[PDB]
Amino acid sequence: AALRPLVKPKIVKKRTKKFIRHQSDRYVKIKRNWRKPRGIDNRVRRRFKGQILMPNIGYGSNKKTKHMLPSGFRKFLVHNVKELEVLLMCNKSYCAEIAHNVSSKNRKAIVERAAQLAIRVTNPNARL
Amino acid sequence: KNLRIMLKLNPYAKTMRRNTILRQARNHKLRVERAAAALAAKSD
Amino acid sequence: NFAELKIKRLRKKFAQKMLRKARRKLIYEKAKHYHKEYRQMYRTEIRMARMARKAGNFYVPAEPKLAFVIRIRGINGVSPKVRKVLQLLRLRQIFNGTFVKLNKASINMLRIVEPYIAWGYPNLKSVNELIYKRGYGKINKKRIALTDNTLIARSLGKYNIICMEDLIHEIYTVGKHFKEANNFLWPFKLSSPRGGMKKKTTHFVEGGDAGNREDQINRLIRRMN
Amino acid sequence: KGKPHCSRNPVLVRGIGRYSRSAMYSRKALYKRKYAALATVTKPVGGGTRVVKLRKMPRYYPTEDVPRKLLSHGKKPFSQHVRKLRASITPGTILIILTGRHRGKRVVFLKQLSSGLLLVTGPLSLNRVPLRRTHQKFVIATSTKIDISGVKIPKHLTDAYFKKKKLRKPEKEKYEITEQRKVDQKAVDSQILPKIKAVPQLQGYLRSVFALTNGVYPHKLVF
Amino acid sequence: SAHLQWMVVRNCSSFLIKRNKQTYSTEPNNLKARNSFRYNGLIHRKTVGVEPAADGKGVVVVMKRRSGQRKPATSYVRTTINKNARATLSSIRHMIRKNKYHPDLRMAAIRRASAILRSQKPVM
Amino acid sequence: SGRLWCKAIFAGYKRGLRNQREHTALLKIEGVYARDETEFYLGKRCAYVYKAKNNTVTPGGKPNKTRVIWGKVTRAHGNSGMVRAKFRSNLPAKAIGHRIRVMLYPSRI
RNA sequence: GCCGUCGCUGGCAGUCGGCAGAGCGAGAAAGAGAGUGGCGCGGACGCUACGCCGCGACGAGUAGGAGGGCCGCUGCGGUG
RNA sequence: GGGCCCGGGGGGCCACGCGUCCCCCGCGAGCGCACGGGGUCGGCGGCGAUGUCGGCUACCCACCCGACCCGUCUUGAAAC
Ligand SMILES: [Mg+2]
Ligand SMILES: [Mg+2]
Ligand SMILES: [Mg+2]
Ligand SMILES: [Mg+2]
Ligand SMILES: [Mg+2]
Ligand SMILES: [Mg+2]
Ligand SMILES: [Mg+2]
Ligand SMILES: [Mg+2]
Ligand SMILES: [Mg+2]
Ligand SMILES: [Mg+2]
Ligand SMILES: [Mg+2]
Secondary structure (H helix, E strand, O other): OOOOOOOOOOOOOOOOOOOOOOOOOOOOOOOOOOOOOOOOOOOOOOOOOOOOOOOOHHHOOOOOOOOOOOOOOEOOEEOOHHHHHHHHHHOOOEOEEEOOOOOHHHHHHHHHHHHHHOOOEOOOOOOO | OOHHHHHHHOOHHHHHHHHHHHHHHHHHHHHHHHHHHHHHHHHO | OOHHHHHHHHHHHHHHHHHHHHHHHHHHHHHHHHHHHHHHHHHHHHHHHHHHHHOOOOOOOOOOOEEEEEEOOOOOOOOHHHHHHHHHOOOOOOOEEEEEEOOHHHHHHHHHOHHHEEEEOOOHHHHHHHHHHHOEEEEOOEEEEOOOHHHHHHHHHHHOOOOHHHHHHHHHOOOOOHHHHHHHEOOEEOOOOOOOOOOOOOEOOOOOOEEEOHHHHHHHHHHHO | OOOOOOOOOOEEEOOEEOOOHHHHHHHOOOOOOOOOOOOEEEEEOOOOEEEEEOOOOOOOOOOOOOOOOOOOOOOOOHHHOOOOOOOOOOOOEEEEEOOOOOOOEEEEEEEEOOOOOEEEEOOHHHHOOOOEEEOHHHEEEEEEEOOOOOOOOOOOOOHHHHOOOOOOOOOOOOOOOOHHHHHHHHHHHHHHHHHHHHOOOHHHHHHOEOOEOOOOOHHHOOO | OHHHHHHHHOOOOOOEEEEOOEEEEOOOOOOOOEOOOOOOOOOOOOOEEEEEOOOOOOEEEEEEOOOOOOOHHHHEEEEEEOOOHHHHHHHHHHHHHOOOOOHHHHHHHHHHHHHHHHHOOOOO | OOEOEEEEEEEEEEEOOOOEEEEEEEEEEOOOOOHHHOOOOOOOEEEEEEEEEEEEEEOOEEEEEEEEEEEEEEEEEOOOOEEEEEEOOOOOHHHOOOEEEEEOOOOOO
16 A cells, blocks of 8 residues: 555566675675685686676666665655655655654654655654 | 568569469479379279 | 648658659569579579580589688687688678688688688578578668668669669679678678587588588578578 | 458468459459548536536646557457467367366367357266366367267357356355356257267266376377 | 856755765755756746645745846745646646746646645545 | 376486586476477476475465475477476475476367 | 677757647758748656767776776865 | 560460650559567456465575685695
8 A cells, every 4th residue: 555656667686695705704804895806816806617706797787677676666865854855756766765863753744744745755664 | 481571671572472382282283183193094 | 821831741752652662663673583583594504504415515514603601610729810811701700601702812811711611602592591581781880680671772772782682682693793782791690500510620521511511501501590 | 432342362371362463453443443632518507608628637647657658569459369279179079177176077178269268068967067168278189079060059158158257255255056057057968968978988988087097198198 | 147057056056965876956946856957946037936835725836037037036926826726737837838938847837736736635 | 086297307407517507407207218209298387396394375275385386398308208397496406306297288289 | 688888979959839830761962942923728758968868889807007986984165 | 595585477464544756666532451660468367364475685404516725926826
């Protein structure tokens, strides 16, 4: 019974696993954030078979469904009611996300206003 | 593989194919007629 | 007043429709003529040989004027001379195909790239199916599928090549404008031979694939086209 | 205006006529058949009258709208598709049903409905399959046939007759065999059944059920 | 001129929002809140603005008068329309088309008026 | 009542010797030991049927532990009756050497 | 099929609407020319031109060079 | 065989107004089907509130295939 987007095409992801950094499973000091390996002998860098995979532009997402949420919208962070009224005329393609640091008192006004304007809110039930 | 695409390029393909279909059906009939005549002749 | 202008518009549209209609009859009759021409060429060679045999002599047919060249070897480790000759034939990729009109200048080039090509003499059906299924024009330096006769007419019309049949006729008979009509065609991108090859690394006469296999190129063209 | 005439060009193959252009021109006698060049409703009112607008402008416009589609061809609705049928499925043929609660039951083919679905009967008294629709891709056509050439099937047995009637639940709702269906079952069965009993042991065949057993492989055996 | 002023504010304005791969403009008389030359509500001699009435009944149509371009106090003319939904749009459609006052904003104004009116209905 | 499917074995995945293409499965069908006997089965439905812990809905039935991955035979494979099958999800490797059902529909006879 | 790059130094200011008239893809230079005599009030989107759109080809990379980062850290001027 | 397959004395033609001089001897109307500028149905079925439906990735586990530990100097590093 939620607000629906103008269209809801099929979202295709060329990949869903994250790219884990080389050897980030072997040490705690190596975080999983990706880093382009650059060792001379690095077998990940040389693209040996069965090794960790490197990101490259080929994995890029379709321009038509890029950044699109599972609901079919695209999010836009808002901090108050005034910021919410920009989405008045793109309410069938962009939803509202209320910033984490907005007090519970101010959320009710935003969540109420968005209901009047038919703007979708991704986190309407938070800090209640 | 697509008849109407071929005609947009070579309209005379339609004439060629029609003649082939008719010539091949005509040729098939004769071979059947010539066969029946020989078979009846053998029966005699 | 607008009624007068509309008439002018309708009449202009009528003229274009008639010009289009008469152009269709031209290419329709051009194909009818080439069909007769091809039949006479085919029947003529048979009649020539029959009369030689009748007299106890030998009829030696004309050496073929046309060849279809296919690149059968990759791009790793090619000697500088072979590499330059393959680019001049426009066979820059494996299983690329081109027509070549034969003469002392070109036959000696084909000898240099002998280990890297399979070539032979294509028959009329090969020229047809090649250009129809895999015919792309080089129009404004782009690869355009020949899905419309206007594509041929705009580029090669000045040489009176205005339809696929004219393009097939110029290539097959090596007309006076073979060079232009042939370079207009993009190198044919053929598929891997369905059924495999014998041995790409040796000559055809050795039981391999490279070199001149004469009319046996047609069997290869069917499996790749 | 003249009455329509059947196409004078008999179809040789799909898309190609039997006769050329000039042959048709003579056939049509085109040599002598030459030719040369509201939105408002006014009403009275108790101003006297008003010019009423038939269709009114929208009272609400969405913030965004989708564009139109590009035009295509050959994408007909289902109702206009041409219906095909396997050459092996002729009326009176015995079919083996492969799916549904009646799977494995041997039934009698009657006719193909306008939607391409098949009409079959058990008959109900032999295997408890009534006048029922089934899909041809989900049956095996055997080589056993009966001659139902002289059977008269009611003309009201159409796709709409067999279409399920939706049942609403707010407990449940149970399907009830309409009295018309029972009457139709006897009308058709009373003709097909005697033809079944002419063939010896055929009725027992229709009571049995098909199954695969040890060493029996479908690709090997004739149906 | 409008084009000169757009070149100064296209990327530097207190009304410019760049966030989440989206760009918005929060100035008045922007019918789509869009950072665009067409919809900018400040740089053109003539502009159209649709806003809800101070009370939640009807819309306020703003048009920029011709003369006082450098006089912000008297520049804008506000009109309150509190009719039924179809009547409100018809007034807006005529105020634009008949006057030839930014005819290219006709549907943007009409779509905005519908969104404001639809908002003023009781919330279900 | 009785069986209405052919017995097939999930032999393995499509592969060379050191590369595995899990999106295709190689099926061995009972009694099909030539490439020319596989024609009856091409396009037929395939069903890897198994059991789990948690109950799941059953079409036309009440929840139970049966589960199925559906697929269909796409083409023959080799000279000895093997067929390639594709499933809505790649088959689990635990299913190798276990029963795969091959249905008698879509019927072409 | 999708992503990006390169190329066409490609197309779009024509949203020219009731002060209206809907085109400029088409084988083959140059005008949808100007004139002088013989009921309804209606018609989607677009265009941050640093934007949007189309078509074709292409894509390995150490040392090294370059571009773009609505990548990230701290402080200052403006702004929110 | 070639000469729009020269000229004279059953089967297909992208022949089909005519005034003429004479080599030779610029607009008809409609209507419909589609192998026609990239898919639609104007086609259906089953289940659903306390145990069931969906949730790529993520947590744990299993299996099949792949898979030697990085940085570095080096012609060559998984390197005893
Ligand atoms: Mg190294
Ligand atoms: Mg080598
Ligand atoms: Mg093969
Ligand atoms: Mg060698
Ligand atoms: Mg690179
Ligand atoms: Mg291993
Ligand atoms: Mg190991
Ligand atoms: Mg070192
Ligand atoms: Mg050393
Ligand atoms: Mg090392
Ligand atoms: Mg060692």
